Write a structure and sequence with these properties.
Strand content of chain F: 5-15%
Strand content of chain D: under 5%
Largest sheet of chain F: 3 strands, antiparallel
Largest interface: C-E, 57 and 56 residues
Radius of gyration of chain D: 18 Å
Helix content of chain F: 10-25%
Number of helices of chain F: 4
Number of strands of chain D: 0
Organism of A: Trypanosoma brucei brucei
Chains: A little secondary structure (55), B alpha+beta (141), C mainly alpha (361), D mainly alpha (42), E mainly beta (122), F little secondary structure (222), G mainly alpha (110), H alpha+beta (256)
Oligomer: part of a larger assembly
Distance between the termini of chain D: 51 Å
Number of strands of chain F: 8
Entry title: Cryo-EM structure of the Trypanosoma brucei mitochondrial ribosome - This entry contains the complete small mitoribosomal subunit in complex with mt-IF-3
Bound molecules: magnesium ion
Distance between the termini of chain F: 48 Å
Radius of gyration of chain F: 25 Å
Largest sheet of chain D: none
Structural class of chain F: little secondary structure
Shape of chain F: flat
Order of helices and strands of chain F: EEEHEEHHEEEH
Shape of chain D: elongated
Order of helices and strands of chain D: HH
PDB class: ribosome
Chain A: mS74
Keywords: mitoribosome, translation, Trypanosoma, 9S rRNA, ribosomal protein
Strand order of the largest sheet of chain F: 6-7-8
Structural class of chain D: mainly alpha
Chain lengths: 55, 141, 361, 42, 122, 222, 110, 256
RNA sequence: UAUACAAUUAUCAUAUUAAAUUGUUAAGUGUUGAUUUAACCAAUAAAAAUAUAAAUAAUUUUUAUUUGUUUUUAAACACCAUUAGGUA
RNA sequence: UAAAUUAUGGUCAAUUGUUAGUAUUCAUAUUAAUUUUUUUAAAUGUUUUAUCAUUUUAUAAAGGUUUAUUUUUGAAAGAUUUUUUGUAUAAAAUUUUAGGAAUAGUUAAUAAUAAUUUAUAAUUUUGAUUAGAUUGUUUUGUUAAUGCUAUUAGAUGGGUGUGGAAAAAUAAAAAAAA
């Protein structure tokens, strides 16, 4: 591992690699991999009545 | 149980069952019953790495009988080719031919086992014989 | 007072409770984050109709009579007189099938007994759990394709719909047991599966389940992001019914396919066979289209009746063609996307565009 | 060392290491998989 | 090597795509979500990515949630190089929903994610 | 592994859905009261084991002697035929079944489920007693043994007992699976398999047996 | 929880060390955590997150011109309406009103 | 400046001109997007086209699905009439009377000499074709044109029992025109486009009314929904407007 | 400066197949007084017991839901301050 | 669910640090490089022609681009006279930054329309747009090896629009009509 990519430590490199790992990719189940936490608890106090046009 | 974890194959687990039941010196193992698994069993029983085996047309399982010699197993090591089912390793005829050669002497010691385009489970030596490439399963000696 | 202010003294583990306070009792969400304050009038009606009692439909008495006319003939002789041989057994193939009296006691078995006993096994005497099982069995029977069927999508969907309603009202009363919040959400997810499989199995039962129990809320695609990627429709590909439709009864297959050797689309071969597959239109599309059809009448009338205004505008267009950025139409001028293919112009040279991408690609 | 790299208990069978390499980048270039879109070596 | 090249013989790569129709807000334009494949030779394994296309369907046959076959063609407008070649699977359900005057599919409950906290009550 | 709750180790030779025994959420083990007869408390109970030792007995076939009539008149109950044997048998485990954690662990405390151990109370046999004889008299049930006609259990048993599994895994030496065999290092077993015809050899199968017999007999290590 | 359980890596021992943290190491980091928390207490720190604002960016309320401890440092610029409201919140947090849930009070909170 | 420099819709080569012309000699202008405007937009429909010899002679009799009383169709067409007449009352001679509404399943020329033999035979073969077919529930929405915008009609959407209809029609087609040689205006191996003719311009009218129904009238009803109808009754009819207030009917078959 | 983790068992912070939730009981007055504490000081002192079965396994909850901070002392113990109270 | 032979075939995979209780790819090793050394470049005036003109002579200045760059024969080749043909501008995939939020002469239909045509429009958390860095998809080094680690350079808007094609304002080492 060339020492100039990402942080000044090694583990920083592998921590960015995990954003490129094949089995780790974003999808309908695993989403918002890179910031999960900025979006957390965001709609708790947002009250949205669900959609019904059918009785 | 979760994402990062490996996705297991009834080959992976076949191998680790046999490994572990060889370590505890058991005479019988119950083992997952799919196609390439009992294929692998027949191949191993050909090469005399296993005392015998049977499929009862039980759906889940069939059973292998282990062989011991001079106080320890007949199996040094047995390892699956792939940790996942999401990874599929392809063996060129030349590679399988390399395995056979130990610095100029023909060496059949170790056995490697393949699927073929034809759905047969073979060792690498027959494969090399007819020059077919196949998908890797496991290696045992 | 204006917006919620959290206040956090950094030595303390967590902030102070914010601002004019959030509503004292936490809202009850569905699986998707939507909020229900209470059951809908319809669901409410389902619970009131479970509570006071249920009934076997004489649908079953009917089919019992037409299927096994002999047995129903025997019972027909024997009314009111105590029976030692249960002729009625065909009517109740399953233990679960008899819900009118407790512990699965068929009505006609109660003939020769005391009426105290008759009041002892009656509906009014059921526990609540028993009554739920009653509603469940009756519905499971309405949508079952044979008697012992459970696994089928329809049956599953109904049972899960009911269970979900029960848990819902339960949570309405006693607010915090998060065990059942969680069990509710899981039930809801499994209901979502059952329904989205139903509409590709047969859609009318799907419809009337939704109209009976009022669950349209768990069929609503959760969020725009994953919907836009076609992973809401992607579901029934996984479930394997994606091709299941069997066209020929609906939607004549002749105009659905393009021509392979010709290269003409399905709109084309449909055109040629003189057929129209056109989805029903809302007001937008009917209006846009109807406004488009008439461009040539309008134009014709314009250039006949009023040649001057026309000629002015034409002067504009004509001279314009000679002014402007490009006159020549080459690979540069004729770039369908200018800002995208030259991004390297965008900051310094070309000031028209603020961004390199206005569309999918 | 909780904070530090995972180590193998024993080595890896080298033979097997060569067997997993069949579809790797070099063998791909030799198969001619990637498209030659630019001038390349002179 | 994915499904698409499995079913089709393509004259040029990406000349054929199978997908689902997501949204029709534009007359004679069907948006289609479609998967393609990427290979990581280091890990010897594949991933499916997804991509949207604008398809030109003359005559508005498509409803949201149709499984369609899609082809490369004449440049039609700025972004549309694909046209709807064939409907593999129509939406029977969605069409019936339309006939009755309702939208083909219920609109998604939440929009895109936010870094804010929206306090909106009743 | 030194972590508590990871002590049960890695066993592959279990029947559970994980090879890591400590993630398995089904059966929590009990280190204090368990493992009298199985050795360690981690290891699977005798009736659940999927791997078998050389000089140890394997699982008894369940019945649920009439069928031995052709055998030695003296022969007692074959050691592997069991009246009551359950592969699914819940063994009482305190941390599961009697769980004292939310208490101060004083004498009566802890939560117990009674659905594990079979009831020794008198209440059951009193409450349910009836003039109508039991299930077996009434022959309520369909089916029977799930494998249909079974020589040990349903139908009569003829010929020989094989208590080691020697014939039960052998390899057919023949295209027809008529002649099967089992080989050791220096020994060779050739077993004629034709139970339907009373072991009468067909023309082909005999001309075959002459091949197997002398192939095995002219072998180098036999 | 918002704040951090630990400061630095408190479980560092050799693999299979059969505890989260040794006595020595945890003691070191309890020293570190102690100094930080003491700094927060004496400088009378205050933070806030506001609704309809980027949340991870927290206004430093202890640095506002009114509530500022230092008589020297220029505090910070926060909008006049939002600042008035923040001041009113910090102020009305202090004391226990009967009927409200009792919440822990300190010198340094004011 | 408000869009693409050369709008893609404006890029047009005319290959029906000539190789050297448009570079040097002269430039040819046209409004080319009237011609390109497609079959969905214009409302055209490709009907089975007649061979010339058959094209010469008038049609006499046709097959029709008879619409019951109390239709959704008839009602909505009546509303459509009212709206149309309030917009333009020049339509008044074009429009068909709501009493004459019927579905046209195919059109045919019968010579007047062999007339009785042919009606008997037809009626018989027709009764045999539809013996097994139970009533048909069909959907009507959308408009379309025959004969260069002279005939304006309501489409039959292939969303419903229509499928059966197509087999059914294609049977009589192979009997009536295939078996006993009869002039069906098309080829008996091709299927007719079923339709409800709403407005029409006949040869005599064409002088006062104009050569094509102006699309401004029916533009807004072009995609309008006329609804579902179940049909039990098939007719073979000779064309006379007078006799019943309906077309003179030479034969009938009941679907049940 | 470039130059090859693990995949059988690894302790600090990215959870996930789960059966809970709800129960109105107890305790209190005779009399002239050194109890508790290593030791001080305020000063009535007695007390709050019951539930199992059942809920099916997995596949698109990750902007949702969830991990010992809680109205009412005119009820105490307890704890903190010291005779004034706080808190419970 | 049987073995195999008419016997080495189908052409080489092979790992080299003297450490300091133990856990963890980390100082001193070799190979490759920079430290390191004038044996491969070069100077100005392009050239004909019918004369103040007209024919021939089309990608090395800088700016910093990651959903990005794409095209013809009408020039020459080119053969006998004159007409003579059609094929092209479009796409698909691969796209960086430790701690991540909105972007905008704007989509689609109409059409050689509309600085106010019509519409429930387009891009984004499957990570956009700005901003940082950076010359994109046969080139290297190390290695037994899935890897790790390089690869130069070259297309920077329009405004009498010439020319087949803008590649058109020093910086060749391309014989440019005897
Ligand atoms: Mg583009
Ligand atoms: Mg810029
Ligand atoms: Mg973690
Ligand atoms: Mg209180
Ligand atoms: Mg340059
Ligand atoms: Mg940039
Ligand atoms: Mg691209
Ligand atoms: Mg392009
Ligand atoms: Mg310029």
């Amino acid at each position: 591992i060339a020492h100039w990519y990402c942080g000044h430590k090694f583990r920083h490199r592998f921590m960015r690699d995990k954003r490129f790992h094949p089995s780790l990719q974003a999808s309908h189940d695993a989403r918002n991999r890179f910031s999960k936490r900025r979006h957390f608890k965001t709609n708790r106090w947002n009250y949205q009545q669900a959609y019904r046009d059918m009785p | 149980r979760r994402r990062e974890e490996n996705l297991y194959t009834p080959i992976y687990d076949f191998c680790h069952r046999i490994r572990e039941a060889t370590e505890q010196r058991k005479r019988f193992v119950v083992v997952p019953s799919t196609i390439e698994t009992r294929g692998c069993a027949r191949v191993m029983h050909d090469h005399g790495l296993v005392a015998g085996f049977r499929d009862f047309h039980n759906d889940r399982a069939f059973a292998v009988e282990l062989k011991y010699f001079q106080g320890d197993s007949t199996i040094n090591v047995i390892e699956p080719c792939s940790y996942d089912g999401r990874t599929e390793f392809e063996w060129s005829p030349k590679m399988m031919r390399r395995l056979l050669n130990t610095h100029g002497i023909h060496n059949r010691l170790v056995v490697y086992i393949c699927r073929t385009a034809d759905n047969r489970i073979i060792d690498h030596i027959h494969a090399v014989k007819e020059n077919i490439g196949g998908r890797g399963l496991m290696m045992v000696h | 007072e204006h917006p919620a202010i959290w206040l956090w003294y950094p030595w303390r583990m967590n902030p102070e409770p914010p601002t004019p306070h959030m509503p004292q009792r936490r809202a009850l969400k569905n699986v998707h984050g939507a909020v229900f304050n209470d059951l809908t009038p319809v669901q409410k009606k389902r619970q009131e109709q479970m509570l006071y009692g249920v009934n076997i439909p004489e649908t079953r008495q009917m089919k019992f009579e037409e299927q096994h006319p002999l047995l129903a003939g025997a019972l027909r002789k024997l009314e009111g007189q105590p029976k030692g041989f249960p002729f009625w057994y065909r009517k109740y193939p399953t233990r679960r099938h008899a819900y009118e009296y407790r512990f699965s006691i068929p009505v006609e078995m109660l003939d020769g007994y005391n009426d105290d006993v008759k009041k002892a096994l009656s509906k009014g005497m059921m526990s609540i759990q028993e009554k739920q099982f009653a509603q469940e069995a009756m519905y499971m029977e309405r949508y079952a394709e044979h008697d012992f069927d459970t696994t089928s999508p329809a049956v599953l969907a109904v049972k899960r719909a009911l269970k979900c309603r029960v848990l819902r009202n339960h949570l309405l009363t006693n607010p915090h047991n998060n065990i059942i919040k969680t069990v509710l959400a899981n039930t809801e997810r499994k209901l979502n599966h059952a329904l989205r499989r139903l509409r590709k199995v047969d859609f009318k039962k799907y419809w009337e389940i939704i109209r009976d129990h009022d669950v349209q809320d768990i069929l609503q695609p959760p969020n725009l992001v994953t919907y836009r990627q076609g992973s809401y429709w992607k579901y029934d590909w996984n479930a394997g019914l994606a091709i299941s439709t069997n066209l020929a009864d609906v939607m004549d297959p002749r105009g659905l396919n393009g021509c392979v050797e010709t290269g003409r689309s399905r709109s084309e071969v449909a055109r040629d066979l003189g057929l129209s597959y056109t989805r029903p239109l809302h007001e937008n599309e009917k209006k846009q289209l109807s406004h488009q059809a008439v461009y040539y009448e309008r134009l014709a009338k314009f250039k006949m009746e009023q040649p001057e205004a026309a000629r002015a505008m034409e002067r504009e267009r004509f001279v314009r063609k000679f002014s402007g950025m490009f006159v020549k139409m080459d690979i540069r001028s004729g770039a369908p996307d200018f800002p995208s293919t030259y991004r390297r112009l965008l900051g310094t040279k070309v000031v028209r565009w603020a961004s390199k991408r206005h569309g999918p690609n | 060392h909780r904070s530090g790299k995972a180590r193998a208990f024993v080595f890896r069978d080298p033979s097997l290491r060569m067997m997993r390499a069949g579809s790797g980048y070099q063998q791909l270039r030799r198969m001619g998989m990637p498209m030659q879109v630019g001038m390349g070596w002179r | 090597y994915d499904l698409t090249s499995l079913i089709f013989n393509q004259p040029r790569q990406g000349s054929d795509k199978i997908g689902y129709v997501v949204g029709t807000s534009m007359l004679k334009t069907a948006v289609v979500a479609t998967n393609h494949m990427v290979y990581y030779p280091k890990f010897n394994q594949r991933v499916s990515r997804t991509k949207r296309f604008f398809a030109h369907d003359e005559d508005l046959a498509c409803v949201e949630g149709d499984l369609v076959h899609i082809k490369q063609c004449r440049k039609i407008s700025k972004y549309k190089h694909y046209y709807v070649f064939s409907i593999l699977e129509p939406n029977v359900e969605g069409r019936e929903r339309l006939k009755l005057g309702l939208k083909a599919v219920p609109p998604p409950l939440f929009g895109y994610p936010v870094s804010r906290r929206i306090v909106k009550l009743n | 592994a030194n972590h508590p709750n990871r002590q049960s180790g890695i066993q592959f030779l279990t029947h559970y859905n994980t090879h890591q025994r400590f993630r398995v959420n089904k059966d929590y083990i009990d280190y204090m009261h368990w493992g009298k007869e199985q050795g360690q408390a981690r290891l699977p109970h005798r009736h659940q084991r999927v791997a078998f030792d050389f000089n140890d007995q394997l699982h008894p076939t369940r019945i649920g002697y009439a069928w031995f009539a052709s055998q030695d008149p003296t022969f007692g109950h074959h050691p592997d035929l069991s009246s009551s044997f359950d592969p699914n048998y819940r063994v009482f485990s305190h941390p599961e079944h009697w769980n004292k954690m939310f208490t101060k662990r004083r004498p009566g405390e802890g939560d117990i489920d009674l659905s594990v151990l079979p009831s020794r109370s008198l209440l059951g046999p009193l409450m349910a007693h009836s003039d109508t004889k039991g299930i077996p008299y009434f022959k309520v049930d369909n089916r029977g043994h799930s494998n249909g006609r079974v020589p040990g259990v349903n139908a009569p048993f003829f010929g020989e007992f094989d208590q080691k599994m020697m014939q039960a895994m052998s390899r057919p030496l023949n295209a027809n699976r008529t002649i099967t065999g089992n080989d050791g290092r220096f020994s060779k077993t050739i077993m004629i398999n034709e139970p339907q015809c009373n072991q009468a050899l067909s023309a082909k199968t005999a001309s075959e047996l002459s091949k197997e017999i002398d192939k095995a007999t002219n072998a180098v290590y036999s | 929880r918002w704040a951090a359980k630990f400061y630095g890596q408190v479980t560092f021992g050799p693999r299979n060390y059969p505890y989260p943290s040794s006595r020595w190491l945890a003691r070191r980091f309890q020293m570190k955590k102690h100094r930080i928390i003491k700094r927060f207490r004496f400088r009378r720190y205050k933070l806030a997150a506001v609704a309809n604002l980027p949340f991870a960016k927290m206004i430093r309320v202890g640095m506002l011109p009114e509530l500022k401890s230092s008589k020297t440092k220029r505090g910070d610029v926060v909008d006049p309406t939002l600042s008035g409201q923040l001041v009113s919140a910090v102020k009305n947090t202090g004391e226990k009103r009967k009927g409200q849930r009792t919440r822990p009070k300190s010198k340094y909170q004011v | 400046e408000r869009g693409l420099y050369f709008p893609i819709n404006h890029r047009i080569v005319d290959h029906r001109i000539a190789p050297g012309v448009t570079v040097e000699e002269t430039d040819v202008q046209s409004r080319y997007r009237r011609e390109l405007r497609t079959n969905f937009a214009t409302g055209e429909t490709r009907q089975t086209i007649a061979p010339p010899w058959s094209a010469r002679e008038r049609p006499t009799h046709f097959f029709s699905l008879r619409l019951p009383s109390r239709n959704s169709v008839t009602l909505r067409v009546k509303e459509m009439h009212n709206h149309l007449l309030f917009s333009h009352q020049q339509c008044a001679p074009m429009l068909v009377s709501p009493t004459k509404l019927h579905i046209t399943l195919g059109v045919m020329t019968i010579p007047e000499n062999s007339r009785e033999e042919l009606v008997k035979n037809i009626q018989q073969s027709m009764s045999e074709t539809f013996a097994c077919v139970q009533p048909l529930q069909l959907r009507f929405r959308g408009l379309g044109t025959f004969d260069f915008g002279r005939v304006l009609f309501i489409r039959v959407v292939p969303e419903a029992d229509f499928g059966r209809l197509e087999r059914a029609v294609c049977d009589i087609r192979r009997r009536v025109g295939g078996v006993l040689g009869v002039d069906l205006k098309g080829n008996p191996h091709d299927s007719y486009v079923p339709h409800v003719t709403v407005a029409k311009i006949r040869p005599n009218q064409r002088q006062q009314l104009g050569d094509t129904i102006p699309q401004s009238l029916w533009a807004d009803y072009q995609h309008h929904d006329f609804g579902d109808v179940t049909l039990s009754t098939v007719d073979l009819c000779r064309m006379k407007g007078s006799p019943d207030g309906y077309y003179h009917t030479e034969g009938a078959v009941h679907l049940s």
